[PDB]
């Protein structure tokens, strides 16, 4: 009698969706709020860190911004233990394609290989599926800039602007009315900054606790250049926007 | 399991794994298709109600396994990142080892065999996504349409509706659609698909995905301007 | 260096007639110029009127006979004691011979018995492992001293019928039991003096519809 | 009471209850009666079917020319052990060039059956077996039990109403031992013993299966008109 | 609900006992073994008119002279068909002889009787022991025509006339008095359609049902919808005359 | 033996593969296709030991076609030579060495310029306006450099090939019974049966 | 050993010999190298004797699996490619052989392929394998025609093997002419060279060296 | 609760529940004892006779490791024969490499590798038998009794089974008979009397006398079973003592 | 016999005052047969320049393997790899498989971005630690450059004066070698700038 569902995750839940995935969604809401925006001139990525006060040095250490390549970039919102495994794994798969084919790996193929890892845990064995959500920002020579979202269920969908954490549906509403096809790099910086302030309980969002990164097409020869903005440069962003 | 046993049967002869696997299809998107004389029409429902979705970068739910053999599913897109890739590898393997174009009946057994293998294997679950396999007879114009279920079985269907409100749409396929005299042209096959979608869809530009597969390796997606063309003809009948 | 396959000598001759099929072979076992055993039987009955004899290296033939018996006894286990035809066991031997192809075993196997029609059938196995249906075939180093002689008195090859010159040859005529025995006795007797590995004594196993009969003949020990 | 679902936990009685649950399959299975002597050995087993048109499957499996057995119990646990004994008889007749001993075969079956029961999960063997065989020491009958015990007896009976034939074999034991070399007296002795265990069931040629093996007479399955003279 | 190593109070296994009742929840499969051949029949079970009957089949071919039939879930049945076809070409290659129908089922039952929750002792390919049943039919050169039934719940049995599925309770009662030794090939084909029509409330035509037979002359031959419809119309002529 | 020669003209890429396949001494067949079509914009031949090059270009074509369906985009010819070199690098280091040469060329739709890559049996990616294999290339290396120019059209490259093949068969005793020429341009694969 | 095959509008004519030589002494003149996969296909034997006997039968059991699955007659290209993949994976480990895949069906028509142990596959019409293969191309191509009748093709195949087995000491025995029709194979009987050589020199008048 | 649910788990009382249930499995069965003398060791165990259908000198459970080590157990029959079959492969591994009979003090460790580990691992159930083995080696006579919990100790005498309580008190009386231990034949007569006094609970069914000893006197270091007149001498001697 | 001697080619590197100059040839061919006259042995990653000789197939194979390892370093430490640390990376890669080694002549050169000191090194078939402040040369024609580069070596050479020093010895070594020729390229590195110049010689 019974003696099931307590070990292997292959047994389906009474609702048809595994309760382990539902509990992973709650861990995503406990993390920060990362809002990506896909545009023709680049992709803007910004998030608010969990650590606080004055004790932790927030200038050097960034857990929500990781660079896979000079084009593809990821935004980590979720559990760090499950995220670190795919960080080195994606770097291996991206360099193997660059080793074998000598080309930049597309986001659709790269995420598909990473999506099967989260799916393989719910497929074979009772291993824990990754409940961390990745925001994939990359550029290709065919479809241009591609922006997807990694769900703990193991799938991914295309998104122009996606938000995680608290107020997920509320952030997508503010970005819809402010969405523009002619939006430049600077136009996406201010609207993403004002939306993040309203969707979070902390309106302060200093320079150290907030991480800001933007891929720009206006570099030399139109090449993709990823510039990591230090908190010293983030402080100047609040002066231009007039919030702080 | 520590002291636990993983063998599951239940007195009804139907395991709880497949019972709750079909619920994911019913709670997911709805899929429908109609096999005509000269062509096969496969409809698909996507949700565009969410804010700022890009269709071009989003992988299409209708995947092309072979030139004359395509595939469309209904359910979670997570389980489709694997089973679809398996049929694509077997498609190139069938054209290699046997020097034969992909057989619609043979490929259906492989797609249904993946879930069939996981039902009998312990510590693993079958894919809870039902796929609709549509292909053509090699060196022939005769269309073929098959259905794949999470139970690991396949059955041949000329018209089928899966997903949310499946039995509701099947009532339209038993009246407007006739198997004894199926629609000969392409437009009449699409009109029955459009009439079947708008019940659970209600128009929309990106919410309707219809891929008409034609012989001689001819595949073209339905244009957005032609979507409202069939909807206009439907509204003309409501005025009478 | 280890020798993959050796040669101890020996000569086997299968014969199939219009009714029965016999098999024979000598008892002489030698190594180089010295005699090992004066009488060592190399011929045994495998059951179902199927007599198998392997001409070639000893342990390779011994490992083939011992594993063939376990294969036939296993055939009756799954099939609940059903007769094994000679044409059925001929194919299964090559599957056992090809599995060892990576370590080739040198043997010449000749089996005798009856087909479904009742006529004698002989299936000879080459050292490569291939086989073909043969009316009469010999084996060993003395096979060249036998094969061309039997085609004269059996197939009547290159022998014209008296009264016809340059037209047709003598038609095929069937021989009785005693006539086949005289073909076996005279084959090994003449090969005894002309071949150093033929001599001692002869074991003739006659396989008929009534059963299997063993007959002994004495050659010259020299 | 969770000790009936766990084979790795010692029950308060001191022995697993799953073995006692497996013993019921022998009683609810086919009823067989057998006996031996210093020359031959006889096993009389009953064949059953699920329909009047259904054939009666043989409960006697021949693993050797001089050695055979009879199965009463679950189907899967029987033929799997028969293939093990089939390989051991061919292993001894090849490597050692000698027939497999009756006591060595019992110890190999106990080690293979206990390995699945003692280990977590596995495939517990709940079928009983009566193994007869001839060697240089004569005929031997070793009763195989799912509990892991193998004992050598002159004869015994298992299945439903096993006490009916067991009582007849104990009082007539001194008579059957002195009788040897006669297959007619050994086969007929097993017919009168199984008749007491069988209730509301007629004795026909298709229902009963008789097999004898010994020094002079090898193993032969008597079916149809072969048992019409002895019955 | 119990474990794999746990035995039922009757002495059988729970997974073996519980899987037996799952056979009666499937399609009705009726067959009869005669001296002139083995006539088989099945009831596809078409619940909708949009269900192609010509592509799907409840009767596969294990060998030229050896047929097969399925009932219930067709998933685990197909895995057993590939194991039978693998063993078919296995023995056909080695001994170049017709597959023994009794030995073929025993080789399939050996894989059909294994199951478990997994372990490190050996490889476990079986989550549950084949909750589907199969009807094996073939012809032998020794005992003639043989019709067995593959039973995952125990030892296979040879039935002259066998009926399984949902109508297994009412069809087997008629098979006793309607079967004799003088049955011919045409009488066996009409008797299957007559019993199937009585136990099933659905109208019998060439669509929802499919027929097959095993004859040593023609081997395995699938009767098309044209010949099947002629046998049904001929059966109605005898029902109206009686 | 097994002559495979190719040259990249201005508007297209001209590739030629041998016809007759000689097994041992005797010629078994005088007409055979020694090349495989990867994508409509890419053509690749194979030459080397008998049976190794035939099976090599197959699963390479299956992997390229499989990777193209996943991305719904045709693999660029520049990345094709990188994937072939990766397999040829592991072939020489495996227990069974495989010596396979390929001519990988086509028309890139992104840059709207043709490209031609020459790879020997060692598996080295080399881009050249012309290329060949076997003992026949030794005669055509100095001849094409003295005559052919980047401004030469496709029609002149066909007549220039007739002069080369005529000198190859006249000087060397071997006879390939003609070559199969397939023009690779923006319009796709175009076969030429005049040779 | 002389094995030739060719196709035309009517069908395929297969002409092989019966001779199998071990060293300098002919082992048997009754050896038949024709292997039957399915009724519509007939394989040859070359190189390794047991390699062709084992693998062509294993290919037949593999083709019977596809007949039970797809329920379609096995094409000549399906069985030839499976054999080419088996010999390629085992290349370098030894196991050398050779043969010619031959079959006549309705779908693909008459077709003949050549399979090498190295994995070489080739499509064409006329093929020959053996040490006397030079005699086949000379005699066949002289009278070779697309409208050539089956009856005249058998008479040409008799002298084709006769001229091949003449100078070649490894070719001989009985000539085997086997033709595959629309309904299946048909054996035309074993024709011994000794009895055939007499009728050729007397009627056609060939072989001026031999007296008579 | 989780205490008595799964085995191989510590208990708040300090003793695992599987140990108490293993002893009850050893207590149910025949009565096995042993005597360690100065010249060798003597083993005595009851043989339960269910009915007359049993054949004598067949089902005897005493197995001998090489010639110098006898073995006898009381407990589950399949677990007893399984442990002996392991020790045979264990004792043969030492004589293979070192070419020397295995010492008895270290012989208890080879059998302990299986018993002590199965108590630690959950996947394998511990043995429910108590094995009493002994013999004579170059280091002298030794007698050991292995417990199902994995522990073991040496004994000049030992008693296991249902009658272990009444037999242990009798073995202590033999110590007061001789300070250096009884002789080879003198211990057999005294061991049989202890066996005959242990049938009070086993009198429901028939029993058979089973005695095996290994000493340096008659066998000169060999382990053999009592046969001939030595068997009937101990029966008639102890039969008059219980009168 | 030697696969590295079939393709040939040399890589020469010299030092100077806050300057490094490494150069190879453009010749690529199998034995007496040539293949590519534009072939470039040296591949650039960050400030570390590594030329490779020997089998041309493995020149790219290890470079793609070296790029595989060096990219993982930049994605973690977030800075370019140093020539001193990169030296052990190549020695450990060639030693990874001892049986059936790779035939390569690699010579690494560059200027440290942190300490600001010139460093050059070279390897052998299986890799080795070789540090010489004068020059490092490898390949078949390297035998000619041992005495030429040493006599022309002077402490604290200007970047332009070092160019004419390494070019004069490289041009004379190309005409005297059958496996070297078809022009050459020299990389002049001042601090952040790399001067790429194609040498003009007399080609055959």
From Swiss-Prot, chain B:
CDD domains: proteasome_alpha_type_7 (cd03755). It comes from the Eukaryota. InterPro entries: Ntn_hydrolases_N (IPR029055), Proteasome_alpha (IPR050115), Proteasome_alpha-type (IPR023332), Proteasome_asu_N (IPR000426), Proteasome_bsu_CS (IPR016050), Proteasome_sua/b (IPR001353). It is found in: Cytoplasm; Nucleus. The modification Phosphothreonine is found at residue 58. GO terms for biological process: proteasomal ubiquitin-independent protein catabolic process; proteasome-mediated ubiquitin-dependent protein catabolic process. SUPFAM superfamilies: N-terminal nucleophile aminohydrolases (Ntn hydrolases) (SSF56235). Its main location: cytoplasm. The proteasome degrades poly-ubiquitinated proteins in the cytoplasm and in the nucleus. It is essential for the regulated turnover of proteins and for the removal of misfolded proteins. The proteasome is a multicatalytic proteinase complex that is characterized by its ability to cleave peptides with Arg, Phe, Tyr, Leu, and Glu adjacent to the leaving group at neutral or slightly basic pH. It has an ATP-dependent proteolytic activity. PANTHER family: PROTEASOME SUBUNIT ALPHA/BETA (PTHR11599). This is Proteasome subunit alpha type-4. The gene is PRE6.
From Swiss-Prot, chain C:
Gene3D superfamilies: Glutamine Phosphoribosylpyrophosphate, subunit 1, domain 1. PROSITE patterns: PROTEASOME_BETA_1, PROTEASOME_BETA_2. One of its GO terms (biological process) is proteasomal ubiquitin-independent protein catabolic process. GO terms for cellular component: cytosol; nucleus; proteasome complex; proteasome core complex, beta-subunit complex. It is found in: Cytoplasm; Nucleus. CDD domains: proteasome_beta_type_1 (cd03757). It comes from the Eukaryota. Keywords: Cytoplasm, Nucleus, Proteasome. Pfam families: Proteasome. Its main location: cytoplasm. SUPFAM superfamilies: N-terminal nucleophile aminohydrolases (Ntn hydrolases). Belongs to the peptidase T1B family. The 26S proteasome consists of a 20S proteasome core and two 19S regulatory subunits. The 20S proteasome core is composed of 28 subunits that are arranged in four stacked rings, resulting in a barrel-shaped structure. The two end rings are each formed by seven alpha subunits, and the two central rings are each formed by seven beta subunits. The catalytic chamber with the active sites is on the inside of the barrel. This is Proteasome subunit beta type-6. It comes from Saccharomyces cerevisiae (strain ATCC 204508 / S288c) (Baker's yeast).
Swiss-Prot record, chain D:
It holds the Pfam family Proteasome_A_N. InterPro entries: Ntn_hydrolases_N, Proteasome_alpha, Proteasome_alpha-type, Proteasome_asu_N, Proteasome_sua/b. Keywords: Cytoplasm, Isopeptide bond, Nucleus, Phosphoprotein, Proteasome, Ubl conjugation. Disulfide bonds: none annotated. It is found in: Cytoplasm; Nucleus. The modification Phosphoserine is found at residue 11. Gene3D superfamilies: Glutamine Phosphoribosylpyrophosphate, subunit 1, domain 1. GO terms for biological process: proteasomal ubiquitin-independent protein catabolic process; proteasome-mediated ubiquitin-dependent protein catabolic process. One of its GO terms (cellular component) is nucleus. There is a cross-link at residue 188 (Glycyl lysine isopeptide (Lys-Gly) (interchain with G-Cter in ubiquitin)). It comes from the Eukaryota. Signal peptide: none annotated. The proteasome degrades poly-ubiquitinated proteins in the cytoplasm and in the nucleus. It is essential for the regulated turnover of proteins and for the removal of misfolded proteins. The proteasome is a multicatalytic proteinase complex that is characterized by its ability to cleave peptides with Arg, Phe, Tyr, Leu, and Glu adjacent to the leaving group at neutral or slightly basic pH. It has an ATP-dependent proteolytic activity. PANTHER family: PROTEASOME SUBUNIT ALPHA/BETA. Belongs to the peptidase T1A family. Present with 7210 molecules/cell in log phase SD medium. This is Proteasome subunit alpha type-6.
Swiss-Prot record, chain G:
One of its GO terms (molecular function) is threonine-type endopeptidase activity. It is an enzyme of class 3 (hydrolase). The keyword Nucleus applies. GO terms for biological process: proteasomal ubiquitin-independent protein catabolic process; proteasome core complex assembly; proteasome-mediated ubiquitin-dependent protein catabolic process. It is found in: Cytoplasm; Nucleus. GO terms for cellular component: cytosol; nucleus; peroxisome; proteasome complex; proteasome core complex, beta-subunit complex. It comes from the Eukaryota. Its main location: cytoplasm. The proteasome degrades poly-ubiquitinated proteins in the cytoplasm and in the nucleus. It is essential for the regulated turnover of proteins and for the removal of misfolded proteins. The proteasome is a multicatalytic proteinase complex that is characterized by its ability to cleave peptides with Arg, Phe, Tyr, Leu, and Glu adjacent to the leaving group at neutral or slightly basic pH. It has an ATP-dependent proteolytic activity. This unit is responsible of the chymotrypsin-like activity of the proteasome and is one of the principal target of the proteasome inhibitor bortezomib. Belongs to the peptidase T1B family. This is Proteasome subunit beta type-5. The lineage of its organism: Eukaryota, Fungi, Dikarya, Ascomycota, Saccharomycotina. The gene is PRE2. The chain holds residues 76 to 287 of 287 of the full protein.
């Amino acid at each position: 009698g019974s003696r099931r569902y307590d070990s292997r995750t292959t047994i389906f839940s009474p609702e048809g969706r595994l309760y382990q995935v539902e509990y992973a969604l709650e861990s995503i809401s406990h993390a920060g709020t990362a809002i990506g925006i896909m545009a023709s001139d680049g992709i803007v990525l910004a998030a608010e860190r969990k650590v606080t006060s004055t004790l932790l040095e927030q200038d050097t250490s960034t857990e929500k911004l990781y660079k896979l390549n000079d084009k593809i970039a990821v935004a980590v919102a979720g559990l760090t233990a499950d995220a670190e495994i795919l960080i080195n794994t994606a770097r291996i798969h991206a360099q193997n394609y660059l080793k074998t084919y000598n080309e930049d790996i597309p986001v659709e193929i790269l995420v598909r290989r990473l999506s099967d890892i989260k799916q393989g845990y719910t497929q074979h064995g009772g291993l824990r599926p990754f409940g961390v959500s990745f925001i994939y920002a990359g550029y290709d020579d065919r479809y241009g800039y591609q922006l997807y979202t990694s769900n703990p269920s193991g799938n991914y969908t295309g998104w122009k602007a996606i938000s995680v954490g608290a107020n997920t549906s509320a952030a997508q509403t503010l970005l819809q009315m402010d969405y523009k096809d002619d939006m430049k790099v600077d136009d996406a910086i201010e609207l993403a900054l004002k939306t993040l302030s309203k969707t979070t309980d902390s309106s302060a969002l200093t320079y150290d606790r907030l991480e800001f990164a933007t891929i720009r097409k206006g570099a030399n020869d139109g090449e993709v250049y990823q510039k990591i903005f230090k908190p010293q440069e983030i402080k100047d962003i609040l002066v231009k926007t007039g919030i702080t | 399991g520590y002291d636990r046993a993983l063998s599951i049967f239940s007195p009804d002869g139907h395991i709880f794994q497949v019972e709750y696997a079909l619920e994911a299809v019913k709670r997911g998107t709805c899929a429908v298709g109609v096999k005509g004389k000269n062509c096969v029409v496969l409809g698909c429902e996507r949700r565009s109600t969410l804010k700022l979705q890009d269709t071009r970068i989003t992988p299409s739910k209708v995947s092309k396994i072979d030139s004359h053999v395509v595939l469309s599913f209904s359910g979670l897109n997570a389980d489709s990142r694997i089973l679809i890739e398996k049929a694509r590898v077997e498609a190139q393997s069938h054209r290699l080892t046997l020097e034969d174009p992909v057989t619609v009946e043979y490929l259906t057994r492989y797609v249904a065999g993946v879930q069939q293998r996981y039902t009998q294997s312990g510590g693993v679950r079958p894919f809870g996504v039902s796929t609709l396999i549509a292909g053509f007879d090699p060196r022939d114009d005769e269309p073929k349409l098959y259905q794949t279920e999470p139970s690991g079985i396949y059955s041949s269907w000329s018209a089928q509706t899966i997903g949310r409100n499946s039995k509701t749409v099947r009532e339209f396929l038993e009246k407007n659609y006739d198997r004894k005299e199926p629609p000969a042209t392409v437009e009449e096959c699409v009109k029955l698909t459009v009439r079947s979608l708008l019940e659970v869809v209600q128009t929309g530009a990106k919410n309707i995905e219809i891929t008409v597969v034609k012989p001689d390796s001819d595949i073209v997606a339905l244009s957005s301007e032609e979507i409202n063309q069939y909807v206009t003809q439907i509204e003309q009948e409501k005025q009478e | 260096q280890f020798n993959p396959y050796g040669d101890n000598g020996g000569t086997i001759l299968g014969i199939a007639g219009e009714d029965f099929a016999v098999l024979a072979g000598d008892t002489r076992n030698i190594t180089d110029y010295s005699i090992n055993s004066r009488y060592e039987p190399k011929v045994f009955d495998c059951g179902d009127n199927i007599v198998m004899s392997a001409n070639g290296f000893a342990a390779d033939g011994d490992a083939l006979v011992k594993r063939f018996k376990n294969s036939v006894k296993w055939y009756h286990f799954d099939h609940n004691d059903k007769k094994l035809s000679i044409n059925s066991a001929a194919r299964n031997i090559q599957h056992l011979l090809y599995g060892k192809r990576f370590f080739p075993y040198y043997v010449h196997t000749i089996i005798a018995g009856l087909d479904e029609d009742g006529k004698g059938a002989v299936y000879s196995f080459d050292p490569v492992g291939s086989y073909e249906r043969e009316q009469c075939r010999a084996g060993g180093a003395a096979a060249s001293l036998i094969m061309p002689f039997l085609d004269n008195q059996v197939n009547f090859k290159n022998q014209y019928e008296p009264g016809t010159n340059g037209k047709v040859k003598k038609p095929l005529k069937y021989l009785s039991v005693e006539e086949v025995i005289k073909l076996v006795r005279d084959s090994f007797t003449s090969a005894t003096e002309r071949h150093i590995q033929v001599g001692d004594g002869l074991e003739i196993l006659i396989v008929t519809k009534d059963g299997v009969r063993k007959e002994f003949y004495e050659l010259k020990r020299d | 009471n969770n000790y009936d679902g766990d084979t790795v936990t010692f029950s308060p009685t001191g022995r697993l209850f799953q073995v006692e649950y497996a013993l019921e399959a022998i009683k609810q299975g086919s009823v067989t009666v057998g006996l031996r002597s210093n020359t031959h050995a006889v096993l009389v087993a009953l064949k059953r079917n699920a329909d009047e048109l259904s054939s009666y499957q043989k409960k006697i499996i021949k693993c050797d020319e001089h050695m055979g057995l009879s199965l009463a119990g679950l189907a899967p646990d029987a033929r799997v052990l028969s293939n093990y004994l089939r390989q051991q008889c061919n292993y001894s007749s090849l490597v050692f060039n000698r027939k497999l001993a009756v006591e060595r075969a019992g110890h190999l079956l106990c080690d293979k059956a206990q390995k699945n029961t003692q280990s977590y999960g596995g495939r517990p063997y709940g079928v009983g077996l009566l193994i007869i065989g001839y060697d240089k020491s004569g005929a031997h009958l070793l009763e195989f039990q799912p509990s892991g015990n193998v004992t050598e007896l002159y004869g015994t009976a298992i299945g439903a109403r096993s006490q009916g034939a067991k009582t007849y074999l104990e009082r007539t034991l001194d008579t059957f031992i002195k009788i040897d070399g006669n297959p007619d007296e050994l086969i007929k002795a097993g017919v009168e013993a199984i008749s007491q265990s069988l209730r509301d069931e007629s004795l026909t040629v298709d229902n009963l299966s008789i097999a004898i093996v010994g020094k002079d007479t090898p193993f032969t399955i008597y079916d149809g008109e072969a048992v019409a003279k002895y019955i | 609900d119990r474990g794999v190593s746990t035995f039922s109070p009757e002495g059988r296994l729970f997974q073996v006992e519980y899987s037996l009742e799952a056979i009666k929840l499937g399609s009705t499969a009726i067959g009869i073994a005669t001296k002139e051949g083995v006539v088989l029949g099945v009831e596809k079970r078409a619940t909708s008119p949009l269900l192609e009957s010509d592509s799907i089949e409840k009767i596969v071919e294990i060998d030229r002279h050896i047929g097969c039939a399925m009932s219930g879930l067709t998933a685990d049945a197909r895995s057993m068909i590939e194991h039978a076809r693998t063993a078919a070409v296995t023995h056909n290659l080695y001994y170049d002889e017709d597959i023994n129908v009794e030995s073929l089922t025993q080789s399939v039952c050996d894989l059909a009787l294994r199951f478990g929750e997994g372990a490190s002792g050996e490889e476990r390919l079986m989550s549950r022991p084949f909750g589907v049943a199969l009807l094996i039919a073939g012809h032998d050169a020794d005992d003639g025509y043989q019709l067995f039934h593959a039973e995952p719940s125990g030892t296979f049995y040879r039935y002259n006339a066998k009926a399984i599925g949902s109508g297994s309770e009412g069809a087997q009662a008629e098979l006793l008095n309607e079967w004799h030794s003088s049955l011919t090939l045409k009488e066996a084909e009409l008797l299957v359609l007559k019993i199937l029509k009585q136990v099933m409330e659905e109208k019998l035509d060439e669509n929802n049902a499919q027929l097959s037979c095993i004859t040593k002359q023609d081997g395995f031959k699938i009767y098309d919808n044209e010949k099947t419809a002629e046998l049904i119309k001929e059966l109605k002529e005898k029902e109206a005359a009686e | 033996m097994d002559i495979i020669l190719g040259i990249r003209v201005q508007d297209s890429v001209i590739l030629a593969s041998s016809k007759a396949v000689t097994r041992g001494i005797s010629v078994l067949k005088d007409s055979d296709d020694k090349t495989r079509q990867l994508s409509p914009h890419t053509l690749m031949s194979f030459a080397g030991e008998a049976g190794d090059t035939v099976q090599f270009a197959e699963y390479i074509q299956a992997n390229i076609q499989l990777y193209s369906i996943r991305e719904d985009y045709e693999l660029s010819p520049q990345a094709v030579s990188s994937f072939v070199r990766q397999e040829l690098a592991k072939s020489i280091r495996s227990r069974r060495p495989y010596q396979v040469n390929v001519l990988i060329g086509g028309y890139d739709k992104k840059k709207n310029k043709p490209e031609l890559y020459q790879i020997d049996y060692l598996g080295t990616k080399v881009e050249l306006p012309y290329g060949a294999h076997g003992y026949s290339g030794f005669y055509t290396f100095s001849l094409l450099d003295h005559h052919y120019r980047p401004d030469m059209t496709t029609e002149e490259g066909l007549d220039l090939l007739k002069l080369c093949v005529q000198e190859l068969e006249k000087r060397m005793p071997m006879d390939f019974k003609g070559v199969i020429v397939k023009i690779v341009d923006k319009d796709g694969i175009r076969q030429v049966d005049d040779f | 050993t002389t094995t030739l095959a060719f196709r035309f509008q009517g069908g395929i004519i297969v002409a092989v010999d019966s001779r199998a030589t071990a060293g300098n002494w002919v082992a048997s003149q009754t050896v038949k190298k024709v292997i039957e996969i399915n009724p519509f296909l007939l394989g040859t034997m070359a190189g390794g004797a047991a390699d062709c006997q084992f693998w062509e039968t294993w290919l037949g059991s593999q083709c019977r699996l596809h007949e039970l699955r797809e329920k379609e007659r096995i094409s000549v290209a399906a069985a030839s490619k499976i054999l080419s993949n088996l010999v390629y994976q085992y290349k370098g480990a030894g196991l050398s052989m050779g043969t010619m895949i031959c079959g006549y069906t309705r779908k693909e028509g008459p077709t003949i392929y050549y399979v090498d142990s190295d994995g070489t596959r080739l499509k064409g019409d006329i093929f020959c394998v053996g040490s006397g293969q030079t005699f086949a191309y000379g005699v066949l191509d002289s009278n070779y025609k697309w409208d050539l009748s089956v009856e005249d093709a058998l008479y040409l195949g008799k002298r084709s093997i006769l001229a091949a087995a003449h100078r070649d000491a490894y070719s001989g025995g009985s000539v085997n002419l086997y033709h595959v029709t629309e309904d299946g194979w048909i054996y035309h009987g074993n024709h011994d060279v000794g009895e055939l050589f007499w009728k050729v020199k007397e009627e056609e008048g060939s072989f001026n060296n031999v007296i008579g | 609760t989780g205490y008595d649910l799964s085995n191989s788990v510590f208990s708040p009382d300090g003793r695992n529940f599987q140990v108490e249930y293993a002893v009850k499995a050893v207590e149910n069965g025949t009565t096995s004892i042993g005597i360690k003398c100065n010249d060798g060791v003597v083993f005595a165990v009851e043989k339960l006779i269910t009915s007359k259908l049993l054949v004598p000198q067949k089902n005897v459970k005493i197995q001998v490791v090489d010639r110098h080590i006898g073995c006898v157990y009381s407990g589950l029959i399949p677990d007893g024969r399984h442990l002996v079959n392991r020790g045979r492969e264990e004792a043969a591994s030492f004589k293979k490499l070192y070419k020397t009979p295995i010492p008895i003090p270290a012989f208890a460790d080879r059998l302990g590798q299986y018993v002590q580990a199965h108590t630690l691992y959950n996947s394998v159930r511990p043995f429910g038998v108590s094995t009493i083995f002994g013999g004579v080696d170059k280091n002298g006579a030794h007698l050991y009794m292995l417990e199902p919990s994995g522990s073991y100790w040496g004994y000049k005498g030992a008693a296991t089974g249902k009658g272990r309580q009444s037999a242990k008190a009798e073995l202590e009386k033999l110590v007061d008979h001789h300070p250096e231990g009884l002789s080879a034949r003198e211990a057999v007569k005294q061991a049989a009397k202890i066996i005959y006094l242990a049938h009070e609970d086993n009198k429901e069914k028939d029993f058979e006398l089973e005695i095996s000893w290994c000493s340096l006197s008659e066998t000169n270091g060999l382990h053999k079973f009592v046969k001939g007149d030595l068997l009937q001498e101990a029966i008639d001697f102890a039969q008059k003592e219980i009168n | 016999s030697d696969p590295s001697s079939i393709n040939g080619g040399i890589v020469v590197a010299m030092t100077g005052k806050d300057c490094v100059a490494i150069a190879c040839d453009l010749r690529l061919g199998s034995q007496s047969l040539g293949v590519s006259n534009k072939f470039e042995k040296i591949f650039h990653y960050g400030h570390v320049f590594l030329g490779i000789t020997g089998l041309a197939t493995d020149v790219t194979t290890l470079n793609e393997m070296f790029r595989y390892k060096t990219n993982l370093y930049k994605l973690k430490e977030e800075r370019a790899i140093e020539p001193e640390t990169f030296t052990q990376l190549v020695s450990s890669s060639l030693y990874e498989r001892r049986f059936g080694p790779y035939f390569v002549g690699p010579v690494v050169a560059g200027i440290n971005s942190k300490s600001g000191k010139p460093f050059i090194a070279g390897f052998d078939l299986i890799g080795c630690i070789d540090e010489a402040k004068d020059f490092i040369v490898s390949g078949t024609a390297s035998d000619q450059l041992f005495g030429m580069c040493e006599s022309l070596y002077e402490p604290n050479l200007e970047p332009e004066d070092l160019f004419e020093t390494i070019s004069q010895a490289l041009l004379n070594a190309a005409d005297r070698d059958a496996l070297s020729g078809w022009g050459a390229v020299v990389y002049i590195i001042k601090k952040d700038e790399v001067v790429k110049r194609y040498l003009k010689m007399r080609q055959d």
